[PDB]
Amino acid sequence: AGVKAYELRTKSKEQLASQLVDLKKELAELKVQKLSRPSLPKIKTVRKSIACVLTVINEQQREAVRQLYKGKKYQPKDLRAKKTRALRRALTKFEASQVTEKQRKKQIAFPQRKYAIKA
Amino acid sequence: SEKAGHQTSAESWGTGRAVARIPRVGGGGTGRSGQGAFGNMCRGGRMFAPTK
Amino acid sequence: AAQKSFRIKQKMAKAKKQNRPLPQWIRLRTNNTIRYNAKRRNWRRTKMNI
Amino acid sequence: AMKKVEDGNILVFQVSMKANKYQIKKAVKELYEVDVLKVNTLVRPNGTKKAYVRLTADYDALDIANRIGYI
Amino acid sequence: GKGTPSFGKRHNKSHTLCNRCGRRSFHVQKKTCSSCGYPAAKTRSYNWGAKAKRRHTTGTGRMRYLKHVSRRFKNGFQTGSASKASA
RNA sequence: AAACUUUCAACAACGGAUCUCUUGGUUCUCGCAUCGAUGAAGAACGCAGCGAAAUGCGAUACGUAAUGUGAAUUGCAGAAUUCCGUGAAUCAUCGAAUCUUUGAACGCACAUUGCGCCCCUUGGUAUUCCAGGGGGCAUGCCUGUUUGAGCGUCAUUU
RNA sequence: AACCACAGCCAAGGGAACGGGCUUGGCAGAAUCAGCGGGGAAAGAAGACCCUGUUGAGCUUGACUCUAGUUUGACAUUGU
RNA sequence: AAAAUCCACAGGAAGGAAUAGUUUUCAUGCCAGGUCGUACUGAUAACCGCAGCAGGUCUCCAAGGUGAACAGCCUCUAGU
RNA sequence: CUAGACCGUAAGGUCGGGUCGAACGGCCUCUAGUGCAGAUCUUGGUGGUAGUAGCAAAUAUUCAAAUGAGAACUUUGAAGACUGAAGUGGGGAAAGGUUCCACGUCAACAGCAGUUGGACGUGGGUUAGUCGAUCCUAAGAGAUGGGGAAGCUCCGUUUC
RNA sequence: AAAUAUUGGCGAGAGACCGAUAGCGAACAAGUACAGUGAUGGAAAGAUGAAAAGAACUUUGAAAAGAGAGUGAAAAAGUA
Ligand SMILES: [Mg+2]
Ligand SMILES: [Mg+2]
Ligand SMILES: [Mg+2]
Ligand SMILES: [Mg+2]
Ligand SMILES: [Mg+2]
Ligand SMILES: [Mg+2]
Ligand SMILES: [Mg+2]
Ligand SMILES: [Mg+2]
Ligand SMILES: [Mg+2]
Ligand SMILES: [Mg+2]
Ligand SMILES: [Mg+2]
Ligand SMILES: [Mg+2]
Ligand SMILES: [Mg+2]
Ligand SMILES: [Mg+2]
Ligand SMILES: [Mg+2]
Ligand SMILES: [Mg+2]
Ligand SMILES: [Mg+2]
Ligand SMILES: [Mg+2]
Ligand SMILES: [Mg+2]
Ligand SMILES: [Mg+2]
Ligand SMILES: [Mg+2]
Ligand SMILES: [Mg+2]
Ligand SMILES: [Mg+2]
Ligand SMILES: [Mg+2]
Ligand SMILES: [Mg+2]
Ligand SMILES: [Mg+2]
Ligand SMILES: [Mg+2]
Ligand SMILES: [Mg+2]
Ligand SMILES: [Mg+2]
Ligand SMILES: [Mg+2]
Ligand SMILES: [Mg+2]
Ligand SMILES: [Mg+2]
Ligand SMILES: [Mg+2]
Ligand SMILES: [Mg+2]
Ligand SMILES: [Mg+2]
Ligand SMILES: [Mg+2]
Ligand SMILES: [Mg+2]
Ligand SMILES: [Mg+2]
Ligand SMILES: [Mg+2]
Ligand SMILES: [Mg+2]
Ligand SMILES: [Mg+2]
Ligand SMILES: [Mg+2]
C-alpha cells in the first residue's frame, strides 16, 4: 500500500531515517527477486514510499531552517519567494508609494473631490 | 495564410534537363526533393491570387 | 573506432536500446494507431552521423 | 556472471555509472559485510556499469550470492 | 577521379557533436558550432532563416520551467499551501 | 477453323479517384501581461511489472507532498480494509519539494564524462598522502567593510 | 531502361518546294525466330554556330561616372 | 623540433654524538594506485562511393625453389 | 457501373437496373479558390517495350552422406584447385557501431536459389597502477591587461 | 495614465473560409523519417464494424494459405 505522509509527519528525524534505510533494504531485496520473478509490482510501491519519506524529511528540515531565519533579514535564497525575476526586481509597495513632502502637501490640500451635476 | 506555398527555397532547374521549368525543391533523400513548387498548378504550391 | 570517447559510446548505447520492433501489446491498447516502429534504424541502411 | 560466482570467488554487480572502484569496494563491504580483494569495472554496451568484485579467500562467493538471494 | 574515387577519402570529420545543441555541427578546428554558435554566449539565429528559428525556438523542447509560469500567474504567484484537509 | 489483336459487357484484378465524414488548418474579433544567475529557452542522457516513439518526469525520475473529487486503471499481469473512506484514479487542482549532465553557465577545461584549490567531516597508523561525504572558488559594475599604495598631499613631533 | 500523337509496304504526284497516312497506281493472307543497320529527316539536349533582345557576365582601356589607397594645402591638436 | 620531466655537479645554508647522537639515493618490510576506451570488420560484403559497386582508403610481420631480385612461375603454414 | 430508356441543336437533364450506406435535392435569389486534352504542366497511379536487354572481369568445380517440404549453392567427409608471405594469411590506425557470439528462425533482403547469412527475432558479450587517453610542448588556437569597433565583435599573447 | 500597435505568448468567441494532392510543411510517434561535412533542406502517411463479435471447429497443404464451418445488418466490411 505504501507509507502515508500524514503518518510520517508525526515522526522524529531519527525514525524517518531508520524507515528510509529499511525501505532501501526492501527495494534492494526486491530488485534481487525481480531477477527471477517475471513481473514485480511491489517495486513501485516501495519506490514511492522512499520518495514519500524523503519528501517528509526535506519538509521537516526546510521548516526548521525557516524557523531559524524567522523574522530576520537575509533569508536563504531557496527559502525566499520564487515569484519572477522582474517581480523580485520591482520596487516594494513602500518604495512605490513614496512621495516628496511637497507632493504630499498638495495631495492633502487639494485632493480630487466628489461632486455631481445635479443642483 | 500569406506564407502558404512559399515556405520553400525551391528554384527552377532551367532548360536542358528534360523537365518543365517550374521551380523545384532542392536537396535529396525525402521524396519532396525535386518536386515542383510555388505554382498554382503545383501540389502543395501557392494558390492563384491568394485571398486577402 | 575501438578507441572512442565516452560521449560516442553513450550515444551508441542509446541507439542500441532503441534498436527493436514495436512491443506487441501496444497494438492491443484502446484507440491504438501505432502500426510498427517507424524510427527503426539499422547499421546497414542509414548511418547515424555520430 | 554466475559461473564466475562459483569459479572465481567473484560477485558480478550492476552498479551506478557515477560509482568508482573505491565506492564500489566500500559499498560491497557495507551492504554484504564481505572483504573485497579486487574490483574490475567496465561500461556495458547498454550504458550500465558492471563491476567484477572478487572477494578474499576468507569469503565464498556462493554463500554470499545465496544470502543476497540469487541462485 | 574527382568523383567516385575521391569519395573514398572521406574518413575525417569536420564537425562533431555540439555541447550546447547536440547537433554534430561543432566545427572541430574552428571550435564553433555552425548551428547554435557555441561557444558564443548568444544563440546563433537569423531572420532570413525563419525555418531554422522555428526548429529551435521556445516551445520545441520541454519548457521545464516556463510551462508552469502561466498557471502561477493565474493564481497570482501565490505562496503557502491549500488550507483544508478533506471533504 | 483456332490461337492472336481489337471493341463491349459481366465477374475478378490493379490502383486509390469519387462521395460522405473531420479531436486539424486558416482568417476575424475579444480579454490578459507572466521567461532568466532564486539559473531560462534549448541540448544530452536516463526513468514504467511488461515502451521503440509521442507525452510526462529527473536517481524522490510516466513521478513525491499538498488540495479537491469520490471508486477507479485497463492491452495483459498485479494489487484492491482504503471502497460509509484523510480515499481509487495515466483524475482534476497545485501554493511544498525533488529537479541527473548541461546550457547566458559561473573553479580551470571540455573532440577529455580531463584537471585543480579552499572549509567541514569520516576512514585508512595521517596539518602534509590516498579515499569517501557535505559546502564552496567566474566576470563587469554599484553601495558599504576591512587591509593597503603613492615626497599626490596636511598637521605632528627626542 | 531509352523511347512512344496515332502508327508502321512501296512508286509517282501535289503539298511548308524529300509522305507511313493525302491523290493515282503497284499490291495485299494468321502467328513468328536469328540477324541487320537503308529508312523511321530514329533516340540523347528548349543549337553551344548565326541573328534578334533596349537580357547578362568575364576581361581590357585614353569609354562614361566614381572609389579604396596615396600625395599636396589649410584649419585644429599647438604650447614657450 | 620544442617542452614537460629525470639526474648530476658547483655552492655551503643549516643540522648532528653517545655507546651507537644523528643521518641514510644500501637491503628488507607495510598501504594504495581513480576516471574513460578495450567486442568485431578494416574492406571484390562491416569504411566512403544512392548498393552486398572490378573504384577509393594509412600502416606492421613475410617460409622453400628458380632467379640478380619483395620480378614472373610452382610450392609449405594459414585462408578461400 | 450500366453498346437499357426518354427530353434538349447543345452545354446538359431525367428514368430504369446493379453496387452502396447517410445524407441530398427542385425553384427564387446571393456569392466564388466555379467547368481542362494539351502548359518538355504538378502529384500520384499505370502501360507497350518485355518475360525483352541482360544476370559473361577476379582460372573451378566434382562425388557421397547428413539435414530438410524442398539442396548446383547449408554442413561434414572425400577430391580437384587457387591466393603463393608487398597474400584471398595474421593484426591494427581513420570510419562504422554490435556488424562480434549463441539460440530460434526464412515473409522481406542476399538482382538464381537458400535449410545458409553482416538478414529477421531474442539474448550474451568489451574486466588494466604497468596498453592508450589522461601530462608535455609543435605548427598553431586563444582568454586577460589594454586598445579598436554603432555593434555583432576585432587586434594582440606579454604586451604601455 | 488613456485613446494607438500587436503574423509572438496565454485565455476565449467566432466564419457565405479549406475539407486529407485542399487547409499551416505537419489532422497521424511532423519540423518527425530521410539527405547533406555544414549552413540548411525536409516528406509521405486519416476512415473495418454499433460492437472484435478480429473467423472456435473440420479438412487439404511442409507452410503461407485454400475449401468448408462460423461472427456480423452486411465479409459485395477479413486490419492488403
Ligand atoms: Mg519510481
Ligand atoms: Mg496549400
Ligand atoms: Mg567523451
Ligand atoms: Mg571504465
Ligand atoms: Mg577499464
Ligand atoms: Mg571521377
Ligand atoms: Mg570539383
Ligand atoms: Mg579541417
Ligand atoms: Mg537547473
Ligand atoms: Mg494528472
Ligand atoms: Mg496524344
Ligand atoms: Mg491516326
Ligand atoms: Mg512520318
Ligand atoms: Mg482526301
Ligand atoms: Mg491506296
Ligand atoms: Mg536507320
Ligand atoms: Mg532554342
Ligand atoms: Mg539554349
Ligand atoms: Mg529596338
Ligand atoms: Mg563569367
Ligand atoms: Mg580487447
Ligand atoms: Mg580485441
Ligand atoms: Mg553519403
Ligand atoms: Mg641463387
Ligand atoms: Mg462503359
Ligand atoms: Mg455509417
Ligand atoms: Mg481555379
Ligand atoms: Mg487531364
Ligand atoms: Mg486546349
Ligand atoms: Mg536474355
Ligand atoms: Mg598456385
Ligand atoms: Mg596465378
Ligand atoms: Mg581484429
Ligand atoms: Mg542482429
Ligand atoms: Mg535471390
Ligand atoms: Mg526465395
Ligand atoms: Mg544459424
Ligand atoms: Mg556471424
Ligand atoms: Mg497536406
Ligand atoms: Mg453493405
Ligand atoms: Mg461491392
Ligand atoms: Mg463495406
Side-chain angles (χ1 to χ4, degrees):
Chain A
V3 306
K4 276 133 173 188
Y6 65 82
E7 294 294 328
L8 294 181
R9 274 156 205 130
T10 65
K11 289 182 170 176
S12 82
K13 208 169 301 284
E14 301 101 319
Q15 306 176 71
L16 289 171
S18 308
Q19 182 166 19
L20 181 51
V21 178
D22 291 331
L23 278 157
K24 271 161 173 181
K25 289 196 196 299
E26 195 180 0
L27 193 57
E29 182 65 26
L30 267 292
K31 280 180 302 189
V32 176
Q33 306 206 349
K34 192 207 205 275
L35 303 158
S36 284
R37 298 187 39 148
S39 302
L40 215 47
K42 185 183 287 185
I43 307 285
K44 177 204 201 159
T45 297
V46 176
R47 208 167 41 240
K48 298 312 156 56
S49 283
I50 283 147
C52 186
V53 172
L54 280 164
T55 292
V56 163
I57 288 173
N58 193 53
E59 295 314 316
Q60 293 188 3
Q61 300 186 277
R62 282 179 79 89
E63 193 57 39
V65 173
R66 295 188 149 100
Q67 280 322 108
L68 183 63
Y69 285 94
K70 193 180 182 307
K72 58 180 48 178
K73 267 177 42 149
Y74 310 131
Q75 263 77 28
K77 270 182 202 199
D78 291 331
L79 301 184
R80 298 171 202 190
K82 181 56 182 200
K83 303 156 297 154
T84 298
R85 192 186 165 102
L87 270 168
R88 299 190 318 260
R89 284 321 180 281
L91 286 181
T92 64
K93 177 206 316 303
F94 173 83
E95 293 150 355
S97 49
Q98 286 286 92
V99 293
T100 77
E101 70 293 2
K102 153 183 211 168
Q103 284 325 293
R104 195 205 41 105
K105 279 180 195 151
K106 274 173 215 195
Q107 280 157 11
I108 286 168
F110 295 105
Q112 168 82 77
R113 312 289 316 252
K114 199 170 299 313
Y115 70 95
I117 306 178
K118 179 248 187 190
Chain B
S1 68
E2 300 294 351
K3 60 190 203 162
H6 275 260
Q7 318 184 81
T8 298
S9 66
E11 291 93 13
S12 186
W13 293 352
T15 58
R17 297 184 64 172
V19 290
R21 307 182 299 209
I22 193 67
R24 305 183 173 274
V25 175
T30 179
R32 176 81 176 141
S33 302
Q35 298 188 330
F38 287 142
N40 56 296
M41 73 291 291
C42 300
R43 187 187 168 272
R46 185 218 54 254
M47 75 176 286
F48 158 73
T51 48
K52 307 283 193 205
Chain C
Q3 287 270 31
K4 310 172 260 299
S5 87
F6 177 83
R7 215 185 296 275
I8 303 302
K9 194 175 147 176
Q10 197 173 30
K11 287 201 93 88
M12 283 143 66
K14 168 162 198 138
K16 176 201 173 45
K17 288 176 278 185
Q18 296 190 306
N19 209 317
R20 73 169 288 182
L22 182 74
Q24 296 294 321
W25 58 269
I26 278 154
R27 319 177 146 101
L28 283 79
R29 303 155 326 155
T30 305
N31 287 331
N32 167 72
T33 61
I34 301 191
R35 284 301 210 257
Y36 64 92
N37 180 9
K39 312 177 165 189
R40 191 80 195 270
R41 179 209 52 94
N42 191 252
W43 69 276
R44 290 180 74 74
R45 264 85 71 84
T46 287
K47 299 296 184 178
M48 65 182 179
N49 311 312
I50 287 306
Chain D
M2 294 299 291
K3 64 90 176 179
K4 280 203 152 90
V5 175
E6 69 275 16
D7 296 5
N9 211 49
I10 294 147
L11 303 182
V12 187
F13 283 110
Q14 182 183 327
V15 308
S16 180
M17 277 298 269
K18 303 200 192 235
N20 62 26
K21 281 168 184 194
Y22 304 117
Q23 300 158 303
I24 297 154
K25 203 206 262 198
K26 179 173 175 286
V28 173
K29 267 172 277 165
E30 156 190 7
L31 301 168
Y32 309 115
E33 293 82 3
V34 300
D35 186 74
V36 176
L37 183 88
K38 203 169 69 173
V39 177
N40 303 129
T41 48
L42 65 84
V43 175
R44 306 201 277 185
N46 76 326
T48 59
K49 183 174 287 186
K50 180 164 56 172
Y52 296 95
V53 181
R54 174 158 172 195
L55 324 179
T56 62
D58 293 295
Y59 298 99
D60 183 11
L62 281 154
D63 56 2
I64 304 304
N66 290 318
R67 169 136 61 76
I68 295 164
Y70 61 103
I71 192 167
Chain E
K2 71 173 84 156
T4 296
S6 66
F7 295 151
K9 291 149 169 63
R10 305 206 185 180
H11 60 251
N12 300 327
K13 277 168 184 137
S14 281
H15 312 75
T16 53
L17 301 165
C18 165
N19 273 12
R20 196 200 258 172
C21 65
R23 176 86 205 132
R24 205 194 76 161
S25 284
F26 199 61
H27 197 268
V28 167
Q29 279 171 279
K30 298 201 255 219
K31 302 288 187 309
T32 187
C33 174
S34 55
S35 200
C36 71
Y38 195 69
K42 284 177 305 152
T43 307
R44 171 178 167 289
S45 197
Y46 295 101
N47 293 294
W48 49 256
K51 270 193 189 194
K53 277 176 140 72
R54 177 161 73 191
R55 281 180 202 110
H56 312 121
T57 197
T58 296
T60 72
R62 295 159 69 157
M63 297 177 71
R64 283 182 302 175
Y65 166 80
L66 258 180
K67 74 163 83 198
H68 304 310
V69 159
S70 62
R71 187 190 65 230
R72 300 204 281 118
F73 161 82
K74 185 193 62 86
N75 298 315
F77 299 109
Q78 42 171 4
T79 79
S81 73
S83 176
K84 274 171 77 73
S86 173

